[PDB]
Protein backbone atom coordinates (compact mmCIF):
# COMPACT_ATOMS: atom_id res chain seq x y z
CA UNK A 1 0.00 0.00 0.00
CA UNK A 2 1.28 3.54 -0.77
CA UNK A 3 -0.52 6.87 -0.52
CA UNK A 4 -1.02 9.14 -3.58
CA UNK A 5 -1.45 12.03 -1.12
CA UNK A 6 -2.62 12.62 2.47
CA UNK A 7 -3.81 16.05 3.55
CA UNK A 8 -5.06 17.48 6.83
CA UNK A 9 -7.54 20.39 6.67
CA UNK A 10 -8.66 22.43 9.73
CA UNK A 11 -12.08 24.02 9.02
CA UNK A 12 -13.12 27.30 10.68
CA UNK A 13 -16.75 26.48 11.64
CA UNK A 14 -16.97 30.04 13.04
CA UNK A 15 -16.64 31.60 9.49
CA UNK A 16 -18.72 28.80 7.76
CA UNK A 17 -21.19 27.12 10.20
CA UNK A 18 -21.80 24.00 8.03
CA UNK A 19 -19.43 21.51 6.39
CA UNK A 20 -21.18 21.36 3.01
CA UNK A 21 -20.41 17.69 2.12
CA UNK A 22 -22.04 14.34 1.60
CA UNK A 23 -20.29 11.03 2.42
CA UNK A 24 -20.47 7.73 0.50
CA UNK A 25 -19.60 4.29 1.88
CA UNK A 26 -17.85 1.57 -0.08
CA UNK A 27 -17.33 -1.93 1.14
CA UNK A 28 -16.76 -5.39 -0.38
CA UNK A 29 -17.44 -8.91 1.06
CA UNK A 30 -13.87 -8.84 2.44
CA UNK A 31 -14.10 -5.83 4.80
CA UNK A 32 -12.20 -3.51 2.35
CA UNK A 33 -13.53 0.03 1.77
CA UNK A 34 -14.24 3.06 3.86
CA UNK A 35 -15.91 6.43 4.01
CA UNK A 36 -15.44 8.81 1.01
CA UNK A 37 -16.32 12.39 0.12
CA UNK A 38 -19.44 12.45 -2.16
CA UNK A 39 -20.49 16.00 -3.06
CA UNK A 40 -18.84 19.22 -2.01
CA UNK A 41 -21.30 22.15 -2.02
CA UNK A 42 -20.25 25.80 -2.53
CA UNK A 43 -20.84 27.97 0.57
CA UNK A 44 -19.67 25.31 3.06
CA UNK A 45 -16.43 25.05 5.11
CA UNK A 46 -14.92 22.25 2.87
CA UNK A 47 -15.48 24.07 -0.51
CA UNK A 48 -13.83 27.28 0.86
CA UNK A 49 -10.64 25.39 1.68
CA UNK A 50 -10.71 23.91 -1.86
CA UNK A 51 -8.28 21.06 -1.19
CA UNK A 52 -10.65 18.13 -0.40
CA UNK A 53 -12.20 16.61 -3.55
CA UNK A 54 -15.02 14.13 -4.36
CA UNK A 55 -13.75 10.51 -3.96
CA UNK A 56 -11.14 11.33 -1.27
CA UNK A 57 -11.15 8.79 1.61
CA UNK A 58 -11.91 10.15 5.08
CA UNK A 59 -9.21 8.75 7.48
CA UNK A 60 -9.85 10.78 10.61
CA UNK A 61 -12.16 13.53 11.87
CA UNK A 62 -10.87 15.41 14.94
CA UNK A 63 -9.43 12.45 17.00
CA UNK A 64 -11.82 9.77 15.56
CA UNK A 65 -10.60 7.04 13.09
CA UNK A 66 -12.99 6.61 10.11
CA UNK A 67 -11.13 3.69 8.45
CA UNK A 68 -13.16 0.86 10.06
CA UNK A 69 -16.48 2.50 10.68
CA UNK A 70 -19.96 1.51 9.47
CA UNK A 71 -21.85 4.05 7.31
CA UNK A 72 -24.50 4.47 10.04
CA UNK A 73 -21.74 5.36 12.60
CA UNK A 74 -19.80 7.62 10.17
CA UNK A 75 -22.98 9.65 9.51
CA UNK A 76 -23.91 9.80 13.23
CA UNK A 77 -20.37 10.75 14.36
CA UNK A 78 -19.93 13.48 11.76
CA UNK A 79 -23.28 15.02 12.89
CA UNK A 80 -22.35 14.85 16.62
CA UNK A 81 -19.09 16.65 15.62
CA UNK A 82 -20.72 19.33 13.40
CA UNK A 83 -23.54 19.80 16.04
CA UNK A 84 -21.19 21.05 18.82
CA UNK A 85 -19.36 24.37 18.23
CA UNK A 86 -15.60 24.39 17.50
CA UNK A 87 -13.02 23.62 14.77
CA UNK A 88 -13.10 20.42 12.73
CA UNK A 89 -9.95 18.75 11.37
CA UNK A 90 -10.47 16.32 8.44
CA UNK A 91 -7.60 14.03 7.33
CA UNK A 92 -8.17 12.53 3.87
CA UNK A 93 -6.36 10.40 1.29
CA UNK A 94 -6.38 11.12 -2.42
CA UNK A 95 -7.08 7.63 -3.84
CA UNK A 96 -5.27 5.98 -6.76
CA UNK A 97 -8.46 4.07 -7.69
CA UNK A 98 -12.05 4.58 -6.42
CA UNK A 99 -12.78 0.81 -5.86
CA UNK A 100 -13.10 -0.60 -2.29
CA UNK A 101 -9.52 -2.02 -2.51
CA UNK A 102 -8.11 0.82 -4.59
CA UNK A 103 -7.29 3.86 -2.45
CA UNK A 104 -3.73 2.73 -1.52
CA UNK A 105 -3.15 0.26 -4.44
CA UNK A 106 -1.87 1.37 -7.91
CA UNK A 107 -4.11 0.15 -10.73
CA UNK A 108 -3.08 -3.18 -12.33
CA UNK A 109 -5.13 -3.90 -15.45
CA UNK B 1 -49.62 9.95 -1.66
CA UNK B 2 -48.17 13.38 -2.54
CA UNK B 3 -48.42 15.57 0.56
CA UNK B 4 -47.94 19.30 1.05
CA UNK B 5 -46.54 20.31 4.40
CA UNK B 6 -46.61 23.97 5.41
CA UNK B 7 -44.25 24.83 8.23
CA UNK B 8 -44.80 28.39 9.49
CA UNK B 9 -41.20 28.39 11.02
CA UNK B 10 -42.32 30.80 13.81
CA UNK B 11 -41.05 28.49 16.59
CA UNK B 12 -38.35 26.58 14.65
CA UNK B 13 -35.40 28.00 12.65
CA UNK B 14 -34.56 24.52 11.15
CA UNK B 15 -36.39 21.55 9.57
CA UNK B 16 -34.58 18.98 11.71
CA UNK B 17 -34.06 16.53 8.84
CA UNK B 18 -31.15 14.86 7.19
CA UNK B 19 -31.10 14.20 3.46
CA UNK B 20 -30.05 11.14 1.46
CA UNK B 21 -29.28 11.44 -2.29
CA UNK B 22 -29.97 8.56 -4.70
CA UNK B 23 -28.52 8.62 -8.30
CA UNK B 24 -32.74 9.89 -8.78
CA UNK B 25 -33.64 12.45 -6.13
CA UNK B 26 -33.33 13.58 -2.50
CA UNK B 27 -35.07 11.74 0.31
CA UNK B 28 -35.62 12.09 4.06
CA UNK B 29 -32.86 10.21 5.93
CA UNK B 30 -33.94 10.89 9.50
CA UNK B 31 -36.08 13.36 11.41
CA UNK B 32 -34.58 15.07 14.53
CA UNK B 33 -36.46 16.01 17.75
CA UNK B 34 -36.72 19.81 18.04
CA UNK B 35 -37.22 20.64 14.31
CA UNK B 36 -40.23 21.89 12.34
CA UNK B 37 -40.70 18.54 10.52
CA UNK B 38 -41.07 16.51 13.71
CA UNK B 39 -43.58 19.09 15.07
CA UNK B 40 -45.72 18.46 11.94
CA UNK B 41 -45.43 14.63 12.14
CA UNK B 42 -46.51 13.75 8.58
CA UNK B 43 -43.11 13.31 6.80
CA UNK B 44 -41.33 9.96 7.39
CA UNK B 45 -37.85 8.61 6.59
CA UNK B 46 -37.61 7.48 2.93
CA UNK B 47 -40.14 10.10 1.68
CA UNK B 48 -38.95 11.88 -1.48
CA UNK B 49 -38.66 15.70 -1.49
CA UNK B 50 -40.21 17.00 -4.75
CA UNK B 51 -40.41 20.82 -4.22
CA UNK B 52 -39.88 23.60 -1.72
CA UNK B 53 -41.86 26.85 -2.06
CA UNK B 54 -42.81 26.06 -5.71
CA UNK B 55 -39.17 25.23 -6.64
CA UNK B 56 -38.98 21.80 -8.28
CA UNK B 57 -35.94 19.60 -7.52
CA UNK B 58 -36.46 17.43 -10.65
CA UNK B 59 -34.35 19.98 -12.64
CA UNK B 60 -31.22 19.92 -10.38
CA UNK B 61 -28.47 17.65 -9.00
CA UNK B 62 -29.07 16.25 -5.49
CA UNK B 63 -26.34 18.49 -4.03
CA UNK B 64 -27.82 21.61 -5.77
CA UNK B 65 -31.24 20.59 -4.34
CA UNK B 66 -29.73 20.53 -0.84
CA UNK B 67 -28.06 23.96 -1.37
CA UNK B 68 -31.40 25.49 -2.45
CA UNK B 69 -33.22 23.85 0.48
CA UNK B 70 -30.58 25.25 2.90
CA UNK B 71 -30.98 28.75 1.34
CA UNK B 72 -34.83 28.70 1.68
CA UNK B 73 -34.64 27.50 5.31
CA UNK B 74 -32.14 30.33 6.00
CA UNK B 75 -34.58 32.98 4.56
CA UNK B 76 -37.17 34.08 7.18
CA UNK B 77 -40.75 32.96 6.52
CA UNK B 78 -42.97 29.90 6.04
CA UNK B 79 -41.78 26.81 4.11
CA UNK B 80 -44.01 24.53 1.98
CA UNK B 81 -42.52 21.08 1.25
CA UNK B 82 -44.05 18.80 -1.35
CA UNK B 83 -43.16 15.14 -0.63
CA UNK B 84 -43.92 11.76 -2.25
CA UNK B 85 -44.67 9.09 0.37
CA UNK B 86 -42.46 6.10 -0.46
Amino acid sequence: AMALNIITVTLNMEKYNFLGISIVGQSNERGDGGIYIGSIMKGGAVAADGRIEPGDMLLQVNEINFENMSNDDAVRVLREIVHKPGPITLTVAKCWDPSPRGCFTLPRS
Amino acid sequence: NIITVTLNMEKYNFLGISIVGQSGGIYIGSIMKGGAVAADGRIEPGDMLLQVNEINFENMSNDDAVRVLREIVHKPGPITLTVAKC
Binding site: I21, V24, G44, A74 | -
Partner: peptide, 8 residues
Protein backbone atom coordinates in the same frame (compact mmCIF):
# COMPACT_ATOMS: atom_id res chain seq x y z
CA UNK C 1 -26.52 6.66 -2.01
CA UNK C 2 -24.91 9.85 -0.55
CA UNK C 3 -25.50 10.99 3.02
CA UNK C 4 -25.54 14.76 3.42
CA UNK C 5 -23.79 15.51 6.72
CA UNK C 6 -25.32 18.90 7.64
CA UNK C 7 -28.85 18.77 9.23
CA UNK C 8 -31.40 21.00 7.39
Amino acid sequence: SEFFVDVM
